[PDB]
Every structure is written in structure tokens, then in C-alpha cells.
Amino acid sequence: MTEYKLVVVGAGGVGKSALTIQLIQNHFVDEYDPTIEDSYRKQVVIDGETCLLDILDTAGLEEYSAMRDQYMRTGEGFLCVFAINNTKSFEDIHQYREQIKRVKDSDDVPMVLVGNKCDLAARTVESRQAQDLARSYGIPYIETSAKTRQGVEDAFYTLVREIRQH
Amino acid sequence: SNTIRVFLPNKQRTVVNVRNGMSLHDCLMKALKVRGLQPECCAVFRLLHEHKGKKARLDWNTDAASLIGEELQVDFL
Ligand SMILES: Nc1nc2c(ncn2[C@@H]2O[C@H](COP(=O)(O)OP(=O)(O)NP(=O)(O)O)[C@@H](O)[C@H]2O)c(=O)[nH]1
Numbered sequence A: 001m002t003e004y005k006l007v008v009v010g011a012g013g014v015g016k017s018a019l020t021i022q023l024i025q026n027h028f029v030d031e032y033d034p035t036i037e038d039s040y041r042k043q044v045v046i047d048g049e050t051c052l053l054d055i056l057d058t059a060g061l062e063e064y065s066a067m068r069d070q071y072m073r074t075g076e077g078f079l080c081v082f083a084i085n086n087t088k089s090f091e092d093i094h095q096y097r098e099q100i101k102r103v104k105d106s107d108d109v110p111m112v113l114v115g116n117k118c119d120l121a122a123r124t125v126e127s128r129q130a131q132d133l134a135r136s137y138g139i140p141y142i143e144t145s146a147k148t149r150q151g152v153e154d155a156f157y158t159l160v161r162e163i164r165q166h
Numbered sequence B: 001s002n003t004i005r006v007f008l009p010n011k012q013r014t015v016v017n018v019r020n021g022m023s024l025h026d027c028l029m030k031a032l033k034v035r036g037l038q039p040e041c042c043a044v045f046r047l048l049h050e051h052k053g054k055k056a057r058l059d060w061n062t063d064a065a066s067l068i069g070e071e072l073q074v075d076f077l
């Protein structure tokens, strides 16, 4: 069968280490634990097909910006994760895509956008404010909250659908 | 770093940061309990970097604070 490689790219303070967790073990994680390089795997059934999700979440802290250009030509699909309560994470999306495009050359990279923490009220970054940005890259936009299981499944499902287009 | 690159079963991996005073059973909970695998029924190896392929088993009650800059390997019994 086919093995889908989901690379999770995002900044710090967001909800990367809560989305990838609440899909495999279905658990929400508080405690800010500075991740560096963790890989995950789960036997899932996406679209009447028992598949496999080899997820690999990355570090948002730019103290490990060396091995970036190693697995970003390995992963079949990417996942830009930010939070609508953090503006700086929204402004660093442009420096992600251009650095992802830098690796695997193409502009047709199977990606999808995730606006985590939609259960808060610190929204400084609206939906269309992010949709108009995601429109430029041509990838969809999904709004999630890894605290209440909202849009969690849709994140690691709709992304696979983007891989099932190319 | 101050890190220990630990490889988990099912072709997975995880790198953890270890503070002094922490063993290898306390600082490896949340970095393993989030995958379903129980530490009780899982082994522990330290990949020797002189032969590359022959690891040595250890004890879970070992201070992992001393293995800074190494590389482990976890197997299921
Ligand atoms: N309210 C709320 N807080 C969340 C949510 N998801 C994550 N958080 C919070 O975000 C903080 C950091 O979580 P974490 O997932 O570790 O962030 P990260 O992106 O993994 N950090 P790093 O990039 O450095 O590994 C924690 O305090 C956690 O409680 C969410 O859906 N809602």
C-alpha cells in the first residue's frame, strides 16, 4: 500500500505538539515541551482505505535550521501550522513556503493551512485574512483547536487529499 | 543539547532533552506514552558507535543524564 509522509512545519508556542498527538493517542497536551525531531506513525483508514500516516513534526525554534533541507525533500506533503492568536506565526508562513519551495523546486507542493487554537478569543488574525494568503499559494485553509478536537481529523485527512491530487 | 536520539519501534524516532537528576523511566514517559507503547513491555538499547549494528541492553533505572550526546534504541519484547 501507499505510505503518506506528513511533515509538520510551524513556529513556536503554537499547537503542533498537540495536533499530531491528539490524532494518534487522542490526547490534548498543555506543558510547553520544546520539541526537536519527533516522528509518529498510525494505521488509519482514510476514504475506505486502510492507510498509514508517518508524521514528522519539526522545531519552530530557529536553532535547528540545518537539517531542514534533509526531510523536506523526503516528505510527500507539508503542513503549515499556526495559531490565529499569534501574529508573528502568520507572518512567517511566507518564509516557510519560499523555503519549502527552495528544497523540492516545484510550486505544486501538496500542502494545507491550519489555524490552530480557534477555541480562544485572542483572534488577531481573521479567516479571510488567512484565506486571501492561502489563496495565493493555492492551498486550502482549515481552522482547528487541539484543545477541543476541532478540525483535528480534518487536518491529517484533507492534506492527504491534496497528495491524492498529484 | 544535551540530547539523546532515541529510536522507537514501528520505524519511528524521538530526540529528548535530559536534565540532571532524571533517570530513563521518568523523562521517557510523555515521549513514549503518546504512541500507545507501554515502557514495561519495551526494551532499551544503546547503539554502539564502534561496530554499528551491535547494541547493548541497559536498565530503565539508569540516569540518562550521563548519556548526553549519544543515541539509543527501543525494542519491543
Ligand atoms: N488554548 C489552546 N492552547 C493550545 C492548543 N494547542 C496547543 N496549545 C498550547 O500551546 C502551547 C505549546 O504547545 P506545543 O504544541 O508544544 O507547541 P509547539 O508548536 O509544539 N512548540 P514547538 O514548535 O517549539 O515544538 C502549550 O501551552 C499548549 O497548551 C489549543 O488548541 N488551544
Ligand SMILES: [Mg+2]
Pocket (backbone or CB within 6 Å): A016, A017, A033, A034, A035, A036, A057, A058, A059
Ligand atoms: Mg513541537
